[PDB]
């Protein structure tokens, strides 16, 4: 009874976690947009100087 | 120290008592080799009657004779005990008055 109870509990937590990680993935892509912007700007500035 | 260091040394252990002149026994029996006299140390002076004894442990040692006056010759057996005499440097033993060949001090007559 108790081992089954524990099992169902771990599964509960597993679903919670999957939700949290999907969320984190989204927030992370947002970060990738920001960083891609900044790195593009500085790539340009560098290219200009060297040219 | 830290908790690790205290774990690593164990708790402090009381060192065993180092053993003295009577070798941990209350008395010793010994024969008189010589009777002589020793001056005390500097601040305070007299001349103190001592003897040299050989002890049942075979070790030979200077020993001191309490009371005023005494009769002790070579070959007398005495019984010695542990009190150290403060004036005399080096003299850690004391004759027991009233046993074997050292008699109790005779009241003035």
């Amino acid at each position: 009874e108790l081992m089954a109870w524990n099992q169902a509990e771990n599964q509960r937590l597993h679903e919670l976690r999957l939700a949290r990680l999907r969320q984190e993935a989204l927030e992370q892509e947002r970060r990738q947009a920001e960083e891609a912007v900044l790195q593009a700007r500085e790539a340009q500035a560098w290219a200009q100087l060297k040219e | 120290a830290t908790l690790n260091q205290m774990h690593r040394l164990g708790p402090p252990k009381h060192p065993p008592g180092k053993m003295g002149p009577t070798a941990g026994r209350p008395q010793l029996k010994g024969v008189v080799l010589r009777t002589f006299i020793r001056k005390p140390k500097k601040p305070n002076s007299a001349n103190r009657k001592c003897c040299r004894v050989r002890l049942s442990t075979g070790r030979e040692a200077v020993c001191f004779i309490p009371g005023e006056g005494h009769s002790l010759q070579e070959h007398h057996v005495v019984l010695v005990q542990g009190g150290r005499t403060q004036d005399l440097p080096g003299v850690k033993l004391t004759v027991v008055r009233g046993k074997y060949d050292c008699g109790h001090v005779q009241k003035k007559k």
């Binding site: 976690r17 990680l21 999907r22 | 908790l3």
Partner: protein, 112 residues
């Protein structure tokens, strides 16, 4: 139904110290022991030889030992049951996914 070992150690879990002998893993097991003066817990370590049939064991792997019913030698009283954490290749028991340290090597939310 009699198969037993007189050992207290019926199941242990420990690190693999060295593999140098044929088919035998050296395994450091560690327990918590309460230092009586400080009332604190420290790790006492002890080694066990374990029998490895397929010589499966790298050094550093966390491993589980079962007590052998009949001692293989004077020093070998255990057989290696499972490999709990392969060294530096670890599959998270929670989410079943490859991970290096605290990072996921393959994300559990990307099934397809």
């Amino acid at each position: 139904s009699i198969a037993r070992s007189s050992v207290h150690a019926k199941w242990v879990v420990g690190k693999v110290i060295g593999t140098a002998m044929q088919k035998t893993a050296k395994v450091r097991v560690t327990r918590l022991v309460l230092d009586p003066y400080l009332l604190k817990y420290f790790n006492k370590r002890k080694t066990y030889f374990a029998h490895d049939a397929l010589q499966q064991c790298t050094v550093g792997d966390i491993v589980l030992l079962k007590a052998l019913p009949v001692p293989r030698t004077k020093h070998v009283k255990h057989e290696l049951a499972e490999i709990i954490f392969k060294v530096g290749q670890v599959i998270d028991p929670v989410t079943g996914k490859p991970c290096a340290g605290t990072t996921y090597l393959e994300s559990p939310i990307s099934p397809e």
